Amino acid sequence: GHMGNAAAAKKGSEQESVKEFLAKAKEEFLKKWESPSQNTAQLDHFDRIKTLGRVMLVKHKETGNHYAMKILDKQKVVKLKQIEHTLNEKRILQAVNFPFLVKLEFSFKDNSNLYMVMEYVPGGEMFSHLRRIGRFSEPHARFYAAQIVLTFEYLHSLDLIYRDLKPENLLIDQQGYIQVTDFGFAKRVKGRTWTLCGTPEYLAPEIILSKGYNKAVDWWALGVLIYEMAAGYPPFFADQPIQIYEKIVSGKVRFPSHFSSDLKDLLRNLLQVDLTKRFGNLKNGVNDIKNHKWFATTDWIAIYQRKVEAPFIPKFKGPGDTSNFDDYEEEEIREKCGKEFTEF
């Protein structure tokens, strides 16, 4: 067969160890999910530095640690029908723990705003680097992809569907690894869900077609991400979203001539309209992806342990250096909506 005895035994043992890891991680998650942390800091603990609601670089006055502080005006969450999403995003962030998920270090609220203070990821969005460099080599793309695969394996084991994968949402840290941010569309659904949400270029066909769907939309989105990282542009685009959606549902995808056969095979199995054939959605689960030829060189445990030398380290001009982030405006920071946000 494909694997001799030694490789087969090694692979089987690795897949069993994943099961054991995920089981413990669900225990840890559910404890924090069921008893979330609240009110772990306050605004005057922080100097505001620069805008990055709003997200601001801030400096903790006593440790000098920098943070990205997401500031959300309560009354403005209400008018935009976002109470549950905001509550849920904070709840998810304070309960998860994974090396490639941004870390909520503090949260608190006051008469006007809700605050989420997470570790500052100084390297900027993958989006900027990808547009600047143009496209990533397949090894470079694969290093990032492996981190998303592991992160989705983690999230999906907690019955969390992420639903907004794109380079805009992937921050690069000082060691060159990814930090996933923005859980505003994530949802803890065991079965199916129906909400039309996400970013047009990344929507799975079953979302476009107004079907009930499941975590398989995240694996479709990984296919779009891998393609975009390796091509420099996404597999489906057009002037307007309605024309993008026609392409997505069409069941056709074209590849640059520099894509390897292995990569095209993987993408044809992720970008699979037929849910009964889509990798990540089959009997073998995530293992169809992890064991694919395109990931043959990936040491999954070394990725998880962050022992792999990253192919790219963003320029690190210092702590609190904001140069990998672009420049924005200048607003100031002023009880409203108290009942709505008790749980925050």
């Binding site: 989006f127 547009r131 907004d164 794109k166 805009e168 569309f185 039309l196 949400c197 996400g198 970013t199 047009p200 270029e201 420099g232 542009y233 685009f237 057009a238 002037d239 074209r254 640059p256």
Partner: peptide, 18 residues
């Protein structure tokens, strides 16, 4: 070319969610 089509789409910048 496909790359040219991408530039012509006008969706090369940061993409908003629905």
């Amino acid at each position: 070319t496909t790359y040219a089509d991408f530039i012509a789409s006008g969706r090369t910048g940061r993409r908003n969610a629905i």
